[PDB]
Amino acid sequence: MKVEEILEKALELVIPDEEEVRKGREAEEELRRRLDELGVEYVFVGSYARNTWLKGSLEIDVFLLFPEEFSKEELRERGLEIGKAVLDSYEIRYAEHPYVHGVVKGVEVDVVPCYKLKEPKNIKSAVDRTPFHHKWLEGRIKGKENEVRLLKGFLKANGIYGAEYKVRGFSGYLCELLIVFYGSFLETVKNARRWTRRTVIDVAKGEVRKGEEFFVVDPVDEKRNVAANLSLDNLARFVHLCREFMEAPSLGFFKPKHPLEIEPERLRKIVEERGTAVFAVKFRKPDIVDDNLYPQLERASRKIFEFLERENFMPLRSAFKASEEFCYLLFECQIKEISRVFRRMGPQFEDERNVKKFLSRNRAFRPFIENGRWWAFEMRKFTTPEEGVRSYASTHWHTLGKNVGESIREYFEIISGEKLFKEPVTAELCEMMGVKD
RNA sequence: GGCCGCGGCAGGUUCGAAUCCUGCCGCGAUCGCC
Numbered sequence: 034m035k036v037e038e039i040l041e042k043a044l045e046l047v048i049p050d051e052e053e054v055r056k057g058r059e060a061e062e063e064l065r066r067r068l069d070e071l072g073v074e075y076v077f078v079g080s081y082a083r084n085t086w087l088k089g090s091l092e093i094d095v096f097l098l099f100p101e102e103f104s105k106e107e108l109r110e111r112g113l114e115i116g117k118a119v120l121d122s123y124e125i126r127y128a129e130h131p132y133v134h135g136v137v138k139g140v141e142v143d144v145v146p147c148y149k150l151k152e153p154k155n156i157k158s159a160v161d162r163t164p165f166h167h168k169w170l171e172g173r174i175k176g177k178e179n180e181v182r183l184l185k186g187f188l189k190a191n192g193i194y195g196a197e198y199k200v201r202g203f204s205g206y207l208c209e210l211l212i213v214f215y216g217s218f219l220e221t222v223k224n225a226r227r228w229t230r231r232t233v234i235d236v237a238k239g240e241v242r243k244g245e246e247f248f249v250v251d252p253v254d255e256k257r258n259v260a261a262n263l264s265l266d267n268l269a270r271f272v273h274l275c276r277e278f279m280e281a282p283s284l285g286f287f288k289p290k291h292p293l294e295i296e297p298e299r300l301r302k303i304v305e306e307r308g309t310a311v312f313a314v315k316f317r318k319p320d321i322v323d324d325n326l327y328p329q330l331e332r333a334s335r336k337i338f339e340f341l342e343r344e345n346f347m348p349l350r351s352a353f354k355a356s357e358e359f360c361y362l363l364f365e366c367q368i369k370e371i372s373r374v375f376r377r378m379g380p381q382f383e384d385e386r387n388v389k390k391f392l393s394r395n396r397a398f399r400p401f402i403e404n405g406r407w408w409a410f411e412m413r414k415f416t417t418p419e420e421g422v423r424s425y426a427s428t429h430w431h432t433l434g435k436n437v438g439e440s441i442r443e444y445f446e447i448i449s450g451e452k453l454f455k456e457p458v459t460a461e462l463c464e465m466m467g468v469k470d
Numbered sequence: 471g472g473c474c475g476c477g478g479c480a481g482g483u484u485c486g487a488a489u490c491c492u493g494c495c496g497c498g499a500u501c502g503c504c
């Protein structure tokens with residue numbers, strides 16, 4: 034329970050037990066049996082090759098090496114073909130580049146096609162980077178794999194480990210690049226408290242300089258940012274969590290957190306005490322990969338948020354949740370109801386060309402002069418945030434994202450009040466409103 | 471394929487528009503991000 038004693042007891046949760054390691058080595062021995070029988074040039078990469086994989090998470094990455102003269106089409110079709118014939122049961126769904134997901138003796142395997150290239154200089158696709166990553170890392174990461182399991186386990190327990198758009202955190206490749214640079218988990222945490230948004234970490238030259246944005250330079254790639262998809266928000270949370278660890282270390286930092294289960298009655302009580310308008314935009318989940326979905330949910334959420342802003346409903350925060358069937362865009366507003374009337378600005382009293390055009394407009398109330406410029410009372414087409422967002426989502430469906438926006442066109446509705454609390458959005462609402470427990 | 475950052479046109483809102491909201495085309499070459 035001392036400061037340095039906790040990093041030892043944490044290794045129980047982040048390091049794989051012997052029951053799991055066997056299951057993996059048995060699967061690897063099976064994959065090679067099948068891959069060698071087909072006589073294909075392959076390489077084992079990822080966390081499994083370097084033995085950095087987290088306990089209770091076993092995922093074997095396998096890359097396929099093809100000649101440069103193979104077409105982008107030929108690479109995909111033969112790549113997928115090998116993947117299908119290798120895995121016991123498979124499912125092919127991709128976005129940027131083709132790959133095959135499946136199961137081999139109970140463990141998950143990823144078969145990704147790419148090119149075999151010498152020197153990383155001219156690289157065609159984005160997947161061609163990985164063979165150079167494994168080459169460069171396996172030599173320097175050997176023996177320190179347990180420090181990588183610590184850093185990864187630290188992040189994942191706080192939910193900032195995913196590099197996908199569902200998280201926007203530190204990629205597993207970045208984790209290994211940090212342990213190599215700072216030598217250990219404990220030391221890595223220390224310097225990360227002084228990180229700014231302008232920090233440039235060049236691992237290749239062992240140098241840290243300053244720059245435009247938070248930039249981790251790939252040893253393989255001087256012009257590519259390893260931390261590119263790391264959100265500024267999660268960057269700050271990491272910096273913060275590092276400060277809270279060093280000052281007062283704890284075993285809770287490596288522990289998965291609570292679901293924050295709030296009964297639908299208590300949540301209603303919270304919204305009342307806040308006195309805010311809480312509503313959601315519900316629509317059918319488009320059937321698409323998460324990396325194509327969540328960037329669209331963000332955009333959809335932001336567009337409606339910016340609308341709420343300029344319509345003077347004074348939004349607070351905006352979250353979103355994706356279940357298996359439906360998607361939810363959640364919002365909180367300070368204004369439950371605004372007035373029918375507002376004041377539109379007119380032209381200054383001097384130029385009568387524009388004034389006369391301004392007064393010509395048929396209006397319910399007389400206009401007026403204030404500080405030497407004309408003003409007029411105009412009427413809103415909606416008095417509540419819910420009415421406003423419905424009017425918005427109906428007309429501006431198209432700019433809410435390619436797939437998401439079209440799903441809103443077909444049908445959507447606004448869930449408010451007790452109807453809203455009966456939906457699987459509770460954990461997201463509490464996190465949004467910051468309820469502690 | 472989706473998203474993002476810019477650049478160029480064409481509209482709309484408006485008294486008018488540099489702000490603001492949409493539509494289309496183009497740029498991204500360690501293939502901007504996955």
Ligand SMILES: Nc1ccn([C@@H]2O[C@H](COP(=O)(O)OP(=O)(O)OP(=O)(O)O)[C@@H](O)[C@H]2O)c(=O)n1
Pocket residue numbers: 078079080081085086087092094132143145160162163166205206
């Ligand atoms: N569908 C794909 C495409 C590419 N890669 C490549 O394989 C490398 C490592 O992949 P990843 O599993 O995501 O990183 P890990 O270190 O293995 O993280 P984890 O321990 O969670 O498995 C990356 O360079 C990535 O480009 C992959 O694993 N899966």
Ligand SMILES: [Mn+2]
Pocket residue numbers: 079080081092093094
């Ligand atoms: Mn992996």
Ligand SMILES: [Mn+2]
Pocket residue numbers: 471
């Ligand atoms: Mn594309």
Ligand SMILES: [Mn+2]
Pocket residue numbers: none
């Ligand atoms: Mn006009």
